[PDB]
């Protein structure tokens, strides 16, 4: 992977632009497929028996998913006629459309591939791309948020934090914990879509920055809880303070930036006379915190992972924005109260 690897990475960047700037329903289908043909090579890279299994599981669960989207595109020719990504019109078309989006974002009945795909990547650079790919179908949902029946969108949000809040408890694999942290945060994504379109995109701004900081802290190789355990005493001790700060912000805690999306999600929902649904969102949010709480015990507690082998030489990773973005990820509570309006 020499110069052309950047070009392969550029087509994912350009692929989302096609989805972003679009008016035609077949144009976004092209935009989704621009990502399909360009993530798989980075999913493989070194060629491993675990990588072959992950890439096939990533393909089959996602290519069939986009094929359900094309049905809803063709129902938009049978009914309502026009090829515009403004409204879905038909309730018959929306049922197949929302489920196709749930296969990438809703996750509540389509989570199954995520913990196996995220674990299957041999490299840390591939972990960023799956948290960046979720930006693409969110642009579609922001365009067609009316007309779609709320009874079978909010079920994809309520159930997702339940399975996300239980699915990380029996996991020691560091990639797997972050895989279920996606599904847990995706419930908050598919909740603001029926109740006020703004702050839904800001939820991405908080999430993507917070997740990109997380994996770039794991540039010093760690794949399990026990491998991230040997970091405070043997490796760099000051580095684990930033891992602590990012993990505390991942769960809902006020002096950190991660509580600031959770503000407006409940605020806009309570304005629409709904109290019984946002209550369930807050109790299930506690279950999300528990995974980060156990993972902060690799940074706070002793835990005895000393080992005979010791590193003396200074570490030099990639670190693209692993210094500027964690400062925004640790503290942005006072910095961003009126910034909800600035995004959209």
């Amino acid at each position: 992977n020499p110069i052309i690897f950047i070009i392969i990475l550029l087509t994912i960047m350009l692929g989302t632009i096609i989805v972003m700037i679009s008016s035609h329903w077949l144009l976004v289908w092209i935009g989704f497929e621009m990502n399909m043909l360009a993530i798989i090579p980075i999913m493989m890279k070194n060629h491993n028996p675990r990588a072959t299994e992950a890439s096939t599981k990533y393909f089959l669960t996602q290519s069939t998913a986009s094929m359900l989207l094309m049905m809803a595109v063709i129902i938009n020719l049978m009914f309502s006629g026009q090829w515009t990504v403004m409204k879905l019109f038909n309730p018959m078309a929306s049922m197949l459309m929302t489920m196709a989006l749930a296969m990438k974002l809703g996750m509540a009945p389509f989570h199954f591939w995520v913990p196996e795909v995220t674990q299957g990547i041999p490299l840390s650079s591939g972990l960023i791309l799956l948290t960046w790919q979720k930006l693409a179908p969110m642009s579609v949902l922001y365009q067609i948020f009316p007309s779609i029946n709320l009874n079978l969108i909010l079920t994809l949000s309520v159930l997702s934090i339940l399975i996300g809040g239980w699915g990380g408890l029996n996991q020691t694999q560091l990639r797997k914990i972050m895989a279920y942290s996606s599904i847990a945060h995706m419930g908050w994504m598919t909740a603001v879509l029926p109740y006020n379109p703004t702050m839904t995109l800001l939820n991405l701004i908080i999430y993507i920055i917070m997740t990109s900081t997380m994996f770039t802290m794991f540039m010093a190789n760690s794949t399990t809880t026990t491998l991230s355990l040997s970091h405070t005493w043997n490796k760099t001790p000051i580095m684990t303070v930033l891992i602590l700060a990012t993990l505390l912000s991942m769960g809902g805690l006020p002096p950190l930036s991660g509580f600031m999306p959770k503000w407006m999600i409940i605020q806009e929902m309570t304005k629409n006379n709904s109290i019984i649904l946002p209550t369930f969102m807050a109790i299930t949010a506690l279950l999300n915190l528990y995974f980060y709480m156990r993972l902060t015990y690799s940074t706070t507690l002793t835990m005895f992972p000393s080992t005979n082998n010791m590193k003396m030489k200074w570490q030099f990773p990639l670190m693209k924005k692993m210094t500027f973005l964690p400062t925004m990820v640790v503290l942005s509570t006072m910095m961003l109260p009126l910034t909800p309006m600035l995004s959209v």
Binding site: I30, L37, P49
Partner: protein
């Protein structure tokens, strides 16, 4: 209306075919071709009966991208037969 009633029923059979697995892995990629074949008939008839002229190019573009997933995903199938003996959905290690 009348012709659309049969090909929508043909679409559901190809949809279940993707969701069904018994030992072999090759059927899924064959069903992916069939799903795109059933979508090709549905797209063509809507533009052909209700004239568009400009939009008749859209299924031709759809024809090209149908093969892209049915080649780049098909290439991954051979890689399974390099690591393992033969392609099986029953033969998986990930948990």
């Amino acid at each position: 209306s009348m012709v659309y009633m049969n090909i929508m029923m043909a679409f559901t059979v190809s949809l279940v075919g993707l969701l069904m697995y018994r030992s072999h892995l090759m059927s899924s990629l064959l069903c992916l071709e069939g799903m795109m074949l059933s979508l090709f008939v549905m797209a063509a008839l809507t533009i052909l009966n209700s004239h568009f002229t400009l939009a008749s190019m859209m299924p031709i573009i759809l024809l090209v991208f149908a093969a892209c997933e049915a080649a780049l995903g098909l290439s991954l199938l051979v890689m399974v037969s390099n690591t393992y003996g033969t392609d099986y959905v029953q033969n998986l290690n990930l948990l």
